Amino acid sequence: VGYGAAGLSWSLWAVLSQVNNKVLMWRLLKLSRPDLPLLVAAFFFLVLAVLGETLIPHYSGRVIDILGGDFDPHAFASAIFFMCLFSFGSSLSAGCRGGCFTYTMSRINLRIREQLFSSLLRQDLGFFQETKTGELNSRLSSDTTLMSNWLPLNANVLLRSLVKVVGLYGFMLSISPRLTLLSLLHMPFTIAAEKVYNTRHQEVLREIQDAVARAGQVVREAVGGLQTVRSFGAEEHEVCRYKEALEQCRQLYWRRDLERALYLLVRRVLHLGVQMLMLSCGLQQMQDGELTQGSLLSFMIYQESVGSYVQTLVYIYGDMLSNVGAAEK
């Protein structure tokens, strides 16, 4: 077992051992600085929504218990009223948060477009001799979209998970530090898989953007010189060229999607295996008498929740880094 542990740790560290992505993300943060008030408001509304959603379940359970057992109309009405009140507040806060995030994304996109265009206007003429207009327009209209395409969802998910993980870890430490230390088995595999997938994903995203630029250049040349293509009866030729470019783009898209699906399958299998391992260890401890049934169930709930939160954090952070770094040009 010692040999196996050493070998597995060595393999994981080989897989585990980025600066360009970090600097590009810092540049994106610098560009997003003017939207600080909107982000402050969004964070405030997110916190309020989480706080209200922590209160709704108590009254939902009260309603269920009243229905199942003795029905007291006054208690039923009070529980319904409080459930509705907290749901209303949480929904209001969630809507405000989503609107703020969406508007921040739109402002960042427009700022990116303006800065890229104003920078292009300053270049020397050799830069425009060595580049193509259709490809520049493809960058300005698609890579800018990629750079800000995830804030509303990814930011929300990341912030929720960050808010919750600390408390869940505290709870599961309160129940059983031994099983809490055991539960860290998943992190190495999670991080290694994320690293491999993120490398592949960023590469394929860059290739996709290049192919999109080539197809855009095909369209640019065909439409700009329409009277010359039509005076040689060469529209079908242009359509064939565009279809070839679109085929290349389609194959790149398929590679991206297939790799992402395989990664999701792999991480689902990892999750199932680690949960089985944790359940087996907890059952052994409970049989030995170390902890009771209720403690085991509570710890399993908390540890599975933190596992899900950590996997989501890792995946979303890697996804944001890939999307930002695919727009390197």
Partner 1 sequence: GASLAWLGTVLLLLADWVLLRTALPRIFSLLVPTALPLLRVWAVGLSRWAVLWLGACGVLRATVGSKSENAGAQGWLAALKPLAAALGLALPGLALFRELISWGAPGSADSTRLLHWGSHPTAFVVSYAAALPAAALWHKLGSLNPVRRLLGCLGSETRRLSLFLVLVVLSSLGEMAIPFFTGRLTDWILQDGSADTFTRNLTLMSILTIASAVLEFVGDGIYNNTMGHVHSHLQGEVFGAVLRQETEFFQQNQTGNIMSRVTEDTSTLSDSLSENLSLFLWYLVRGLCLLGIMLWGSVSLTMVTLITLPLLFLLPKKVGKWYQLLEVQVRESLAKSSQVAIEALSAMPTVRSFANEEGEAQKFREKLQEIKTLNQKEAVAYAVNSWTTSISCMLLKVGILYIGGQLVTSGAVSSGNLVTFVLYQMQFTQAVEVLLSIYPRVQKAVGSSEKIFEYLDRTPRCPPSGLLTPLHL
Partner 2 sequence: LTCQRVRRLLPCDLDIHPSHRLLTLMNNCVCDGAVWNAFRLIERHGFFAVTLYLCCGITLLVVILALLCSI
Close Cβ partners of 60 (under 8 Å, ≥ 6 residues apart): 83
Q: Do 191 and 314 contact (CB within 8 A), yes or no?
A: yes
Q: Does 215 bind partner 1 (CB under 8 A)?
A: yes
Shortest spacing between CB 143 and partner 1, in angstroms: 12
Shortest spacing between CB 92 and partner 1, in angstroms: 6
* Amino acid symbol at 264: L
Decide whether 28 or 326 has the Cβ nearer to partner 2. Answer: 28
Distance CA 153, CA 256 (A): 20
Q: Does 74 bind partner 2 (CB under 8 A)?
A: no
- Nearest CA among 210, 145, 174, 190 for reference residue 291: 174
- CA distance to 108, 203, 324, per residue, from 115 (Å): 11, 25, 16
| SS3 assignment, position 292 | coil
Q: Does 222 bind partner 1 (CB under 8 A)?
A: yes
Q: Does 70 bind partner 2 (CB under 8 A)?
A: no
Dihedral sign for Cα 9, 11, 12, 17, please. Answer: positive
Give the residue, chosen from 55, 85, 120, 140, that forms a contact with partner 2 under the rule CB under 8 A: 55
Q: Does 159 bind partner 2 (CB under 8 A)?
A: yes
Shortest spacing between CB 265 and partner 1, in angstroms: 5
Give the residue, chosen from 25, 60, 99, 219, that forms a contact with partner 2 under the rule CB under 8 A: 60
Q: Does 84 bind partner 2 (CB under 8 A)?
A: no
Report 47-76 residues binding partner 1 (CB under 8 A). Answer: 60, 63-64, 67-69, 71, 73, 76
Decide whether 83 or 211 has the Cβ nearer to partner 2. Answer: 83
Distance CA 68, CA 252 (A): 55
Report 91-110 residues binding partner 2 (CB under 8 A). Answer: none
Mark the segment that binds partner 1 (CB under 8 A) among 16-24, 86-94, 176-184, 185-193.
86-94
Mark the segment that binds partner 1 (CB under 8 A) among 81-89, 157-165, 175-183, 201-209.
81-89
Dihedral sign for Cα 264, 270, 273, 277, please. Answer: negative
Dihedral sign for Cα 228, 232, 233, 238, please. Answer: negative
